[PDB]
């Protein structure tokens, strides 16, 4: 039974998965795909067993019968007596970030600016802000709100891809995987840091992890938190230290999904895998560390303490929460039930 086939998205996650595979005695093996949607299809076909997904994709996967199995849990200063694997998930803060030097830019003056998104269909980088924007303008032309953007996964010849740069060679412009320079939390923030965009739609944790010497990548190496500002919904700007009172929403954590008939087996293998390669696991950091990838968030986010049990044996709708599930349905009206593949 207990071989789990992970689905990696892109060549970089593939490399990391191959390392995990080798260190696991081939308990985990790897399948690769160019996009998250493709990976979901591989899981539906039964050619892969699982992968960690942002909440927006969990919505896509859930409609096709896939279920949440274990969720990412980061550091917290409450619930601590309880062990990480048993602790409830706090969710993360979706935020809109701008440069302080870019004075006078607020939530009320984003029209015609340049934006940086993690990817299309993702929670913090797309679903939350575009949902909020459609709603406030009473219009579905969200592709004409910003003058130019980098929204991995949109038509590469549309304005929503204009700011994306592709890989080393300019190839793969706008693909929704790490090959694209401005993909994901880190990529979208880089897009803002290099002044390619006016605002980045990421999470709270991204800002802190790539400023004040926390990174060391050459583009982040000199960034300082005082150079950035959060855009609050009230038309006000605040230091990044004010996220708890200046965010767009709380997002449910990224979670591992698998086909329902495979959930229990995937779950067992993963709990044994994090005991070996997790934060203080038998072989981290001496041999391989599952939750570390040099600020690239490959397979899993780098700030992950552990993969936690769910409790309540939640369906995907209960896991995402009815608030966030109606938000996505209304936004997708711009482009009630049925699986896409
Ligand atoms: C937003 O994100 C930062 C980092 O993810 C949080 O600050 C971390 O908080 C932990 C304890 O919760 C501290 O021990 C770490 O030292 C902090 N990290 C760093 C790198 O500074 C912060 O709690 C979050 N703020 C809000 C309002 O959510
Ligand atoms: C966009 O607006 C719609 C319409 O109000 C929001 O959907 C509603 O959300 C509330 C709160 O969850 C429910 O009580 C309503 O029933 C929903 N209405 C409809 C028509 O479905 C949606 O939340 C908004 N999107 C965002 C991102 O805020
Ligand atoms: C960590 C995964 N959670 C998602 C929130 C499973 C859950 O169902 N948790 C939960 C808790 C702990 C308290 C109140 C309400 C909810 C539903
Ligand atoms: C692989 O899984 C098997 C089955 O439980 C376990 O006995 C073995 O020790 C595991 N090895 C590693 C390194 O995970
Ligand atoms: Fe996310
Ligand atoms: Zn809030
Ligand atoms: Zn239930």
Curated annotation (Swiss-Prot):
Q: Where does Fe(3+) 2 bind?
A: 54, 92, 185, 254
What does the PTM comment state? Poly-N-acetyllactosaminic carbohydrate moiety seems to be needed for TLR4 activation.
Localization of this protein: Secreted; Cytoplasmic granule
Q: List the disulfide bonds.
A: 7-39, 17-30, 64-339, 84-306, 116-191, 140-334, 150-164, 161-174, 232-246, 284-289
Where are the glycosylation sites? 27, 135, 204
Which residues are in the Transferrin-like domain? 4-333
Q: At which positions is hydrogencarbonate 2 bound?
A: 118, 122, 124-125
Assembly and partners?
Monomer. Found in a complex with LTF, CLU, EPPIN and SEMG1. Found in a complex with MPO and LTF; interacts directly with CP, allows Fe(3+) incorporation into LTF and activation of CP ferroxidase activity.
| Biological role stated in the UniProt entry | Transferrins are iron binding transport proteins which can bind two Fe(3+) ions in association with the binding of an anion, usually bicarbonate. Lactoferricin binds to the bacterial surface and is crucial for the bactericidal functions. Has some antiviral activity against papillomavirus infection. N-terminal region shows strong antifungal activity against C.albicans. Contains two BBXB heparin-binding consensus sequences that appear to form the predominate functional GAG-binding site.
Q: Which family does it belong to?
A: Belongs to the transferrin family.
Descriptive protein name: Lactotransferrin
Please spell out the taxonomic lineage of the organism that makes this protein: Eukaryota, Metazoa, Chordata, Craniata, Vertebrata
- Residues shown, of full length: 361 to 705 of 708
